[PDB]
């Protein structure tokens, strides 16, 4: 209805008392119903329990207007504090309301029923009394008075949403289920008794504007809130500058000090991630065929990636010392292969040993080192996958694991220095009356052209340069051409 009670001016109050005798009867269906109070009158709500939600909004009430409400009782009134007395300004008789929406910036004291409820707590403070069943809560930022959520005896779970609050402004407290701010009115939660907090195991869910999901868990002796689910897309939405690389956010959360649930699900972006703090283990789960993936190691945890039949895995240069070993699991078929390695980052020394149904590779750059573990879901590692080490050295995994013995002893697979890095390997039998071109690469000055004879008879090439400058011919390491 109309906005007849907006401010606290005497005229608005006068029209409120004059029009409070009006009667409204509402008979909604199961498709959803949203009633708003006009500030004065008699309301007859005739809804149905079949309907999913039935909201009753109080945002038409004036700012900083203290009110109390109870969904349990059918007939009630609101004591408007007119000058020096109280006047019944609402006369509410509800039948099917399950949602109680408070004011905008006023004190609110609402009580739910023994069924599912949803509360929109006002940004003015007060005391919220929960009901039974399942109850959801929505609380904005910058409260004026600490809230006290009174949990019920017959309630089974509670979920709270903070659409305008990022985790950076929250602060963890050990063995305190309540929520504590840094600078603001903290919110306290407490049931009718302080003995049955253990009943809310997996039943106390909290959300965050950045996408963080907080979840209570019981320790060996107490109760503590921790982190289970994280959204990486919404975190980039709120932090467009930082990198969508899960361990970065993981170490941020570690720095803030929040505890973690036994299993953590990173959801968002393009892949899914499972993290375990107990084993300190970060696993990725790939589901898109032929998807190039950046596999990076880390010092704080062990990384493992499970691929799809066709995807290509990239290994970039390690940057810090003592990178924990990383593992790759291959789902390749016998006719969809994987380029499991694109070791163009810094392949100075590449060695390998053959462990039980797996290959352990050591990749050492000039000063750093990295450990990789190739394995597969099938008990026999596929021999079709490609391992690329030099720009023109792409071998098959079958040849590799044929080289390695079964004793488990390391075998050198690649070492730089022995030969230069071939940028274009060309065969003499395919060089007859041909025209070879090499792309331009900034700097480097290492564009070579390895002429492999493999013919059995000495050959002679009489070629001329159309564009370039020939810097001699290489013989040995550390020796001018």
């Amino acid at each position: 209805p109309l906005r007849v009670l907006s401010d606290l001016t005497p005229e608005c109050t006068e029209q409120a008392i004059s029009l409070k005798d009006y009667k409204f009867i509402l008979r909604g269906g199961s498709g959803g119903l949203a009633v708003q109070v006009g500030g004065a009158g008699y309301y007859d709500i005739d809804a149905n329990l079949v309907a999913k939600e039935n909201t009753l909004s109080f945002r038409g009430l004036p700012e900083e207007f203290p009110l109390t409400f109870d969904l349990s009782k059918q007939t009630q009134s609101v004591m408007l504090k007119t000058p020096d007395d109280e006047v019944p300004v609402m006369t509410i008789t509800q039948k099917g309301i399950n949602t109680l929406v408070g004011t905008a910036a006023g004190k609110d004291r609402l009580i739910g029923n023994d069924k599912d409820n949803t509360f929109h707590t006002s940004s003015g403070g007060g005391t919220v009394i929960s009901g039974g069943g399942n109850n959801r809560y929505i609380i904005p930022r910058d409260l004026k008075t600490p809230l006290t959520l009174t949990l019920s005896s017959n309630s089974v779970s509670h979920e709270i949403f903070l659409p305008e609050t990022t985790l950076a402004e929250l602060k963890p407290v050990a063995f305190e289920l309540s929520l504590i701010y840094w600078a603001g009115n903290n919110i306290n939660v407490q049931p009718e008794d302080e003995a049955k907090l253990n009943h809310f195991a997996g039943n106390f869910r909290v959300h965050t504007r950045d996408g963080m999901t907080l979840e209570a868990v019981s320790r060996e002796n107490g109760i503590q809130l921790a982190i289970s689910l994280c959204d990486v897309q919404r975190w980039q939405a709120v932090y467009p500058e930082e990198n969508n690389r899960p361990d970065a956010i993981l170490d941020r959360l570690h720095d803030m000090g929040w505890s973690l649930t036994p299993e953590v699900r990173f959801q968002g972006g393009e892949t899914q991630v499972s993290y375990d703090p107990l084993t300190r283990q970060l696993v990725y789960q790939l589901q898109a065929r032929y998807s190039e993936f950046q596999l990076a190691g880390s010092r704080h945890h062990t990384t493992a990636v499970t691929g799809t039949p066709g995807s290509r895995y990239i290994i970039m240069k390690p940057v810090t010392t003592q990178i924990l070993p990383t593992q790759i699991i291959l789902a390749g078929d016998n006719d969809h292969p994987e380029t499991i390695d694109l070791l163009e980052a810094s392949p100075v020394l590449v060695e390998g040993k053959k462990d039980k149904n797996s290959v352990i590779l050591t990749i050492a750059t000039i000063q750093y080192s990295l450990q990789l573990t190739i394995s597969g879901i099938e008990e026999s590692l596929p021999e079709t996958t490609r391992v690329a080490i030099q720009p023109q050295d792409t071998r098959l995994l079958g040849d590799v694991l044929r080289i390695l013995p079964d004793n488990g002893n390391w075998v050198g697979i690649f070492r730089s220095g022995h030969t230069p890095t071939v940028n274009r390997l060309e065969n003499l039998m395919a060089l007859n009356q041909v025209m070879t071109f090499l792309p331009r690469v900034s700097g480097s000055a290492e564009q070579v052209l390895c002429l492999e004879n493999l013919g059995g008879v000495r050959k002679k090439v009489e070629g001329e340069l159309l564009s370039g400058k020939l810097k001699g011919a290489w013989k040995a390491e550390g020796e001018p051409t």
Binding site: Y290, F293, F437
Partner: protein, 240 residues
């Protein structure tokens, strides 16, 4: 690249069902098309195609017309040529070698318009998700207007058709090359530029390598239709 002649021949196939073979010279390709005329009907003469590229710089080559190539249509033949080009086939390498040789005839790296007139263009693009069987022959695709898309002529040396990106790799074989201006390219790379707002007429989208995330599309340049949508239903931009 200057000759562009055509040879007409007649073969007494079996007793009296003679056929007519037209031979075309395209650098290393010896294109032959065989029409049977009244073999089945006065009109609608079944045609076939085959190529006899000089691979590995050979000097002799024999064509017995029964062991090298099968009966194909125009679109099937063009799609077969594209499939050879995307794979590491000796035919594509020989064509690229001949084109590069023809580029440096005058002494510098200049690409004349009559050189394009003789050769098709090739593009590659990546698609996040490709609907399985959504594009059909006779559709009209359009080049983005905000950007100025680029096309290549050789794809072996330039390292273009390598599997780059994650998703569906779509290769494009354009026939009509006249009207696309030549970009100022380095001496050894070939790259032309396609005017934004230039429609293409899709012919024979073939997707037999869908399980390998590979799609081949043969396009024919058209004028200016501006009649309907020309992008993926999902919304990711073509000509990436």
């Amino acid at each position: 690249e200057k000759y562009n002649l055509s040879i007409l021949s007649e073969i007494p196939q079996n007793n009296n069902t003679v056929v007519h073979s037209i031979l075309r010279v395209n650098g290393p390709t010896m294109q032959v098309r065989t029409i049977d005329y009244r073999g089945t009907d006065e009109n609608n003469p079944i045609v076939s195609f085959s190529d006899t590229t000089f691979i590995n710089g050979e000097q002799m080559l024999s064509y017995d017309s029964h062991s090298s190539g099968r009966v194909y249509s125009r679109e099937e033949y063009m799609m077969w040529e594209l499939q050879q080009r995307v794979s590491e086939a000796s035919s594509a390498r020989t064509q690229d070698y001949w084109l590069m040789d023809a580029a440096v005839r005058n002494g510098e790296w200049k690409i004349t318009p009559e050189l394009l007139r003789h050769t098709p263009g090739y593009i590659r693009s990546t698609v996040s998700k490709w609907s399985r069987g959504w594009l059909k022959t006779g559709t009209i695709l359009q080049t983005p207007e905000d950007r100025n898309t680029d096309v290549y002529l050789t794809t072996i040396q330039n390292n273009v058709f390598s599997r780059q990106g994650g998703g569906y790799q779509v290769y494009y074989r354009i026939d009509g090359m006249a009207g696309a201006d030549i970009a100022d390219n380095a001496p050894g790379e070939t790259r032309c530029t396609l005017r934004p707002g230039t429609c293409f007429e899709v012919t024979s989208v073939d997707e037999r390598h869908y399980e390998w995330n590979i799609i081949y599309v043969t396009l024919k340049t058209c004028g200016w239709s501006r009649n309907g949508q020309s992008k993926t239903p999902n919304g990711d931009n073509l000509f990436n």
